[PDB]
Amino acid sequence: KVFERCELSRTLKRLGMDGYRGISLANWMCLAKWESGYNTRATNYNAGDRSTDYGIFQINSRYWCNDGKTPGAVNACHLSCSALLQDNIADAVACAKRVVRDPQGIRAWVAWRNRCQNRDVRQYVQGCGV
């Protein structure tokens, strides 16, 4: 599913992402926007290390979910990577929360550092009623 901007912001807010571990909803929106264009079925294979990024937040299989084909990988979210490709984002959100409980927090995603950190992210939620 490809979420519309405001539709997604309300979905994320209902799922408890607004301010989760000090991360505002606008930051999560900026993250999902730049990671997948709000697309839940997005996948990206990384030929260099044989891992794959899954879903709306493009969570990597090396550390976060199990896809059975990533060498020496772990499954910190204790989910099949398939769970990160559903239209319903509950599992992807649960996993994204797990990612940020680690020291790096939102910085775990390089795209966030590139396109969101120290940026004006207000525009991602303007007019969405969140």
Side-chain angles (χ1 to χ4, degrees):
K1 164 184 183 174
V2 176
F3 279 82
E4 284 185 77
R5 185 177 64 95
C6 292
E7 177 193 9
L8 181 62
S9 76
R10 289 187 292 269
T11 298
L12 289 175
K13 194 178 190 301
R14 276 190 302 267
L15 287 165
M17 291 289 254
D18 189 5
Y20 187 81
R21 296 284 292 166
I23 303 159
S24 73
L25 191 61
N27 276 283
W28 290 115
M29 285 297 295
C30 183
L31 177 68
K33 166 58 177 44
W34 289 106
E35 285 300 343
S36 66
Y38 310 138
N39 178 13
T40 63
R41 80 185 310 280
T43 56
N44 180 57
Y45 181 59
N46 301 288
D49 82 327
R50 303 201 150 133
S51 68
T52 297
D53 306 317
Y54 296 88
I56 197 164
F57 296 125
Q58 289 290 272
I59 288 166
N60 191 263
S61 61
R62 180 149 300 284
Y63 318 93
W64 310 105
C65 62
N66 179 50
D67 62 0
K69 54 167 164 41
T70 306
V74 292
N75 182 4
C77 292
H78 295 96
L79 290 169
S80 154
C81 296
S82 170
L84 304 183
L85 299 173
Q86 308 174 69
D87 278 8
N88 180 280
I89 64 173
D91 294 330
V93 160
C95 188
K97 287 178 190 184
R98 173 60 185 86
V99 173
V100 306
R101 283 181 212 134
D102 272 12
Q104 290 186 287
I106 192 72
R107 284 153 167 84
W109 288 272
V110 172
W112 180 83
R113 282 133 84 165
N114 300 347
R115 355 278 302 210
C116 310
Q117 172 169 200
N118 302 149
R119 306 262 195 175
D120 186 340
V121 291
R122 284 185 171 83
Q123 59 167 313
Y124 294 102
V125 300
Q126 300 315 264
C128 304
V130 294

